[PDB]
Amino acid sequence: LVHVASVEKGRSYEDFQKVYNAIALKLREDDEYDNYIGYGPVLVRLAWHISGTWDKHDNTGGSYGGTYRFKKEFNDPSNAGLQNGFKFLEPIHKEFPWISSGDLFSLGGVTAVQEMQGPKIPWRCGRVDTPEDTTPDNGRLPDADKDAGYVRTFFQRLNMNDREVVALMGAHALGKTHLKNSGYEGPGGAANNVFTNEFYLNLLNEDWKLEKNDANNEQWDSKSGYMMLPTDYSLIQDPKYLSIVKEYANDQDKFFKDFSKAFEKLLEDGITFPKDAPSPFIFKTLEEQGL
């Protein structure tokens, strides 16, 4: 399967910076969502789940085709709760009907991270919508109730290595688990709509307790009111993972730099970019624009 990036006709940096600003302006406006967390965390989760279907072996799945717009992927049990990120973006797609679905879902994730004061993420245009029959089947996204060997093995399919996996998981400092979506409940920290390295700090400094929640699932709970998933706590159980966790709890700039590279790579897996294709765009935030 080859998927070649095709820039939307005649579009350039300024067009996509207009779509960025539209998403970012609505993130500021619709602030009440999920008890004032706002839409940013569900939008970086949506960009991860449309990319996380990729399989390196046959180049199926991935962010290129925008296939989450089809019922099979929209109704995947693993995507429960992401309909709220879709409905947030649907106004903006009506306003810029020329951007492809893959591009709009991935730029929403980029915009949310930078607007929640994360690192800049280089983003590239050119994903092309593909037919309903290209939609990957349910079951390619990871279970939460498993251990470190499962996480390592699952992420080899998206060929991410240990460092990349640990840098990507730092995004679980954002938002929260919702019992009616996943059977898990609670936030992982106090700053859950500002991008920081707090996931790593909480993992190493809190007093975790294995408890059973109302959906009868086990999760790691702390006195402070935070929770960690079994696959999250996995990172301090494995010796290779645990020493990268310590590296990111001791250096927030290295965390930001490595997250930026692994999230771009995540979003680009499966796509062939021609050598005459434009460079990756670095978008300015509303704040850097005085907007």
Closest by alpha carbon to 185, among 236, 233, 226, 235?
226
Sort strands 208-212 and 227-228 into parallel, antiparallel or unpaired. Answer: unpaired
Q: Is 107 in the site for ligand HEM (CB under 6 A)?
A: no
| Separation in Å, CA 194 to CA 43, 168, 209, 244 | 14, 16, 26, 22
Nearer residue to ligand HEM within complex by CB, 42 or 92 = 42
From residue 149 to residue 188, the character string flagging contacts with ligand HEM as x (rule: CB under 6 A) and all else as - is --x----------------xx-xx-xxxxx--xx-x----
Residue 8 CB, nearest distance to ligand HEM (Å)? 25
Nearer residue to ligand HEM within complex by CB, 15 or 145 = 145
27, 44, 125, 236: which one binds ligand HEM (CB under 6 A): 44
Nearer residue to ligand HEM within complex by CB, 67 or 217 = 217
Helix, strand or coil for residue 186?
strand
73 vs 55: CA distance, rounded Å: 15
Give the Cβ contact number of residue 178 at 10 Å: 15
Residues touching ligand HEM, count (CB under 6 A): 24
Stretches 8-16, 43-51, 129-137, 201-209: which one binds ligand HEM (CB under 6 A)?
43-51
From residue 247 to residue 266, the character string flagging contacts with ligand HEM as x (rule: CB under 6 A) and all else as - is ----------------x---
Residue 36 CB, nearest distance to ligand HEM (Å)? 12
Q: Nearest 5°: CA angle at 71, between 171 and 127? A: 60
Residue 64 CB, nearest distance to ligand HEM (Å)? 18
CA 275 from chain centre, in angstroms, equals 27
H or E segment at 210? strand 208-212
Q: Is 231 in the site for ligand HEM (CB under 6 A)?
A: yes
Nearer residue to ligand HEM within complex by CB, 11 or 196 = 196
CA 269 from chain centre, in angstroms, equals 14
CA atoms within 13 A on the CB side of 257: 6
Q: Is 41 in the site for ligand HEM (CB under 6 A)?
A: yes
Residue 285 CB, nearest distance to ligand HEM (Å)? 19
Q: How many helices (H) and strands (E) does the chain have?
A: 14, 3
11, 16, 23, 48: which one binds ligand HEM (CB under 6 A): 48
| Separation in Å, CA 279 to CA 271, 273, 274, 275 | 14, 10, 11, 9
Nearer residue to ligand HEM within complex by CB, 18 or 212 = 212
Binding site residues, ligand HEM, CB under 6 A: 41-42, 44-45, 48, 81, 142, 144, 151, 168-169, 171-172, 174-178, 181-182, 184, 229, 231, 263
